[PDB]
Design an enzyme around this catalytic site. Structure first.
Site, PDB file in Angstrom:
ATOM      1  N   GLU A  22       0.813  -1.207   0.000  1.00  0.00           N
ATOM      2  CA  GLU A  22       0.000   0.000   0.000  1.00  0.00           C
ATOM      3  C   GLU A  22       0.852   1.264   0.000  1.00  0.00           C
ATOM      4  O   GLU A  22       0.556   2.218  -0.714  1.00  0.00           O
ATOM      5  CB  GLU A  22      -0.922   0.004   1.214  1.00  0.00           C
ATOM      6  CG  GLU A  22      -1.874  -1.177   1.249  1.00  0.00           C
ATOM      7  CD  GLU A  22      -2.662  -1.237   2.534  1.00  0.00           C
ATOM      8  OE1 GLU A  22      -2.032  -1.321   3.613  1.00  0.00           O
ATOM      9  OE2 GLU A  22      -3.908  -1.200   2.467  1.00  0.00           O
ATOM     10  N   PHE A  72       3.303  -5.716  21.346  1.00  0.00           N
ATOM     11  CA  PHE A  72       2.999  -7.003  21.942  1.00  0.00           C
ATOM     12  C   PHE A  72       4.243  -7.468  22.686  1.00  0.00           C
ATOM     13  O   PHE A  72       5.030  -6.644  23.157  1.00  0.00           O
ATOM     14  CB  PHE A  72       2.598  -8.004  20.855  1.00  0.00           C
ATOM     15  CG  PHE A  72       1.456  -7.536  19.998  1.00  0.00           C
ATOM     16  CD1 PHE A  72       1.670  -6.629  18.964  1.00  0.00           C
ATOM     17  CD2 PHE A  72       0.158  -7.968  20.252  1.00  0.00           C
ATOM     18  CE1 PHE A  72       0.608  -6.157  18.196  1.00  0.00           C
ATOM     19  CE2 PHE A  72      -0.911  -7.500  19.491  1.00  0.00           C
ATOM     20  CZ  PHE A  72      -0.684  -6.592  18.462  1.00  0.00           C
ATOM     21  N   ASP A 100      -8.433   3.315   7.347  1.00  0.00           N
ATOM     22  CA  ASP A 100      -9.040   2.268   8.173  1.00  0.00           C
ATOM     23  C   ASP A 100      -9.507   2.910   9.472  1.00  0.00           C
ATOM     24  O   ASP A 100      -8.708   3.456  10.230  1.00  0.00           O
ATOM     25  CB  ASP A 100      -8.022   1.148   8.448  1.00  0.00           C
ATOM     26  CG  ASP A 100      -8.637  -0.059   9.148  1.00  0.00           C
ATOM     27  OD1 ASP A 100      -8.157  -1.190   8.906  1.00  0.00           O
ATOM     28  OD2 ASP A 100      -9.581   0.113   9.947  1.00  0.00           O
ATOM     29  N   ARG A 191     -10.365  -8.764  11.170  1.00  0.00           N
ATOM     30  CA  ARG A 191     -10.602  -7.412  11.673  1.00  0.00           C
ATOM     31  C   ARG A 191     -11.093  -7.398  13.124  1.00  0.00           C
ATOM     32  O   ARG A 191     -11.955  -6.604  13.495  1.00  0.00           O
ATOM     33  CB  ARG A 191     -11.601  -6.668  10.773  1.00  0.00           C
ATOM     34  CG  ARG A 191     -11.098  -6.416   9.347  1.00  0.00           C
ATOM     35  CD  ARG A 191     -12.061  -5.519   8.563  1.00  0.00           C
ATOM     36  NE  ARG A 191     -12.263  -4.228   9.220  1.00  0.00           N
ATOM     37  CZ  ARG A 191     -11.369  -3.244   9.241  1.00  0.00           C
ATOM     38  NH1 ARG A 191     -10.196  -3.391   8.631  1.00  0.00           N
ATOM     39  NH2 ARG A 191     -11.640  -2.114   9.885  1.00  0.00           N
TER      40      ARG A 191
HETATM   41  O1  UDP Z   1      -4.971 -12.359   1.022  1.00  0.00           O
HETATM   42  C1  UDP Z   1      -5.283 -11.165   0.996  1.00  0.00           C
HETATM   43  C2  UDP Z   1      -6.472 -10.596   1.558  1.00  0.00           C
HETATM   44  C3  UDP Z   1      -6.648  -9.268   1.535  1.00  0.00           C
HETATM   45  N1  UDP Z   1      -5.726  -8.405   0.987  1.00  0.00           N
HETATM   46  C4  UDP Z   1      -5.926  -6.948   1.023  1.00  0.00           C
HETATM   47  O2  UDP Z   1      -6.634  -6.613   2.208  1.00  0.00           O
HETATM   48  C5  UDP Z   1      -7.806  -5.825   1.860  1.00  0.00           C
HETATM   49  C6  UDP Z   1      -8.928  -6.056   2.850  1.00  0.00           C
HETATM   50  O3  UDP Z   1      -8.549  -5.623   4.158  1.00  0.00           O
HETATM   51  P1  UDP Z   1      -9.553  -5.783   5.387  1.00  0.00           P
HETATM   52  O4  UDP Z   1      -9.714  -7.233   5.654  1.00  0.00           O
HETATM   53  O5  UDP Z   1      -9.103  -4.882   6.483  1.00  0.00           O
HETATM   54  O6  UDP Z   1     -10.984  -5.276   4.789  1.00  0.00           O
HETATM   55  P2  UDP Z   1     -11.537  -3.776   4.472  1.00  0.00           P
HETATM   56  O7  UDP Z   1     -11.857  -3.135   5.813  1.00  0.00           O
HETATM   57  O8  UDP Z   1     -10.430  -3.062   3.717  1.00  0.00           O
HETATM   58  O9  UDP Z   1     -12.782  -4.004   3.631  1.00  0.00           O
HETATM   59  C7  UDP Z   1      -8.115  -6.253   0.435  1.00  0.00           C
HETATM   60  O10 UDP Z   1      -8.870  -5.242  -0.224  1.00  0.00           O
HETATM   61  C8  UDP Z   1      -6.720  -6.396  -0.166  1.00  0.00           C
HETATM   62  O11 UDP Z   1      -6.186  -5.147  -0.554  1.00  0.00           O
HETATM   63  C9  UDP Z   1      -4.570  -8.881   0.397  1.00  0.00           C
HETATM   64  O12 UDP Z   1      -3.745  -8.150  -0.130  1.00  0.00           O
HETATM   65  N2  UDP Z   1      -4.414 -10.247   0.441  1.00  0.00           N
HETATM   66 MN    MN Z   2      -9.106  -1.319   4.365  1.00  0.00          MN
END
Ligand code: UDP
Ligand code: MN
Length: 351
Positions: A22, A72, A100, A191
């Site tokens: 990112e 941690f 986020d 999450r």
């Molecule tokens: O194996 C994986 C799973 C997820 N992602 C990344 O992690 C994001 C999702 O992050 P999160 O689970 O925090 O969900 P969000 O809150 O972004 O919807 C995806 O859009 C991808 O960019 C990734 O690179 N590899």
């Molecule tokens: Mn996100």
């Protein structure tokens, strides 16, 4: 005009990790709009310069990608500590990219002063006193302000759809027709259970062939409020730059978010899914006004509707191709506004 961008709590090297990916994508998209930018991280690398080898005040703008600052067990996490020491030395405004909701800017000193290795640092060394401007992915600035109510120097807030960066990259490419091996797919982490209700609703006990890829694991789903019997198949995480290709393995891909994301955040997954070969199916609650796509067929209100919609797509290849054509068309309509998006970003960082 010299810009420096850093990740506040993760080392940056290449695309083998998500936070690094990112940060590099942002460095690239900013460079692509004609700006001079350097990524500063722990050590020198292909894309980075070391904190110890540059003067933070040699930069006219300091941009910080949001991250957790939690510590941690074990040795001090230098990715967090060195980044904050760097920020503490800056004498101008800091721009915090808030993508986020769970990662608002926060001071690390309070969490350090009590640690056993606390003696290695000082408040003067870690206390960031420069004014901070939060650039919020979410349009609702009240939610962003509430997330930062504990930090006094955060005095400015402005909305900007940061995560559209993936569709504006110079090397962007739509996914091509792919041999299907799955009905529904979703990639992400647990999450900390902030989205458990929706994950169980749309991905569990559906009777469909569903895959959940990412850091999440079946054993993490044990909240008594959201019981289940049959879980989707969990597979490991994959590189961020391989996500759209992964989504393309399924007939449809799910779009859900945290409660505070509903009608507020248009997350990166929206773009990764829209650009894939999988039909985008969105939880009605996530976008009640259907602002993403003005076509009700792309929305599902509950498990029952998702099952019906997926089976309709399995039954009619024409319906599937038609919806894919529609979502790719809408995606391109947004990519056509890249100039406006770039100008808005420049304005957000006071350029
Ligand atoms: O194996 C994986 C799973 C997820 N992602 C990344 O992690 C994001 C999702 O992050 P999160 O689970 O925090 O969900 P969000 O809150 O972004 O919807 C995806 O859009 C991808 O960019 C990734 O690179 N590899
Ligand atoms: Mn996100």
């Amino acid at each position: 005009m010299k810009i420096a961008i850093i990740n506040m709590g993760n080392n940056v090297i290449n695309f083998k990790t998500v936070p690094s990916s990112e940060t590099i994508y942002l460095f690239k998209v900013i460079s692509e709009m004609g700006l001079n930018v350097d990524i500063i991280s722990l050590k020198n690398g292909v894309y980075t310069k070391s904190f110890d080898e540059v003067d933070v005040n040699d930069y006219d703008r300091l941009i910080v990608v949001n991250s957790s600052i939690n510590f941690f067990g074990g040795k001090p996490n230098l990715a967090i500590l060195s980044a904050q020491k760097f920020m503490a030395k800056y004498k101008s405004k800091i721009y915090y990219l808030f993508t986020d909701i769970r990662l608002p800017f926060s001071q690390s000193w309070p969490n350090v002063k009590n640690r056993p290795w606390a003696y290695l640092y000082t408040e003067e060394e870690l206390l960031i006193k420069s004014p901070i401007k939060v650039i919020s992915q979410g349009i609702n600035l009240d939610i962003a302000k509430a997330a930062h109510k504990k930090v006094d120097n955060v005095i400015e807030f402005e909305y900007f759809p940061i995560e559209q960066y993936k569709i504006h990259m110079n090397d962007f490419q739509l996914s091509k027709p792919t041999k299907k091996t799955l009905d529904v797919i979703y990639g992400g982490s647990f999450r900390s259970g902030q989205r458990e209700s929706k994950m169980v609703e749309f991905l569990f006990d559906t009777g469909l062939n569903i895959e959940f890829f990412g850091n999440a694991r079946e054993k993490q789903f044990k909240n008594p409020k959201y019981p289940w019997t049959k879980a989707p198949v969990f597979t490991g995480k994959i590189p961020m730059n391989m996500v759209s290709e992964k989504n393309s393995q399924a007939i449809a891909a799910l779009i859900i978010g945290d409660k505070n994301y509903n009608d507020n955040f248009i997350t990166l997954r929206v773009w990764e899914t829209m650009a894939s070969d999988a039909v985008m199916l969105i939880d009605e609650e996530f976008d009640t006004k259907h602002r993403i796509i003005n076509d009700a067929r792309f929305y599902v209100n509950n498990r029952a509707e998702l099952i019906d919609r997926v089976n309709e797509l399995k039954h009619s290849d024409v319906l599937r191709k038609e919806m894919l054509s529609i979502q790719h068309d809408i995606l391109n309509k947004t990519r056509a506004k890249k100039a406006e998006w770039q100008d808005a970003f420049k304005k957000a960082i006071d350029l």
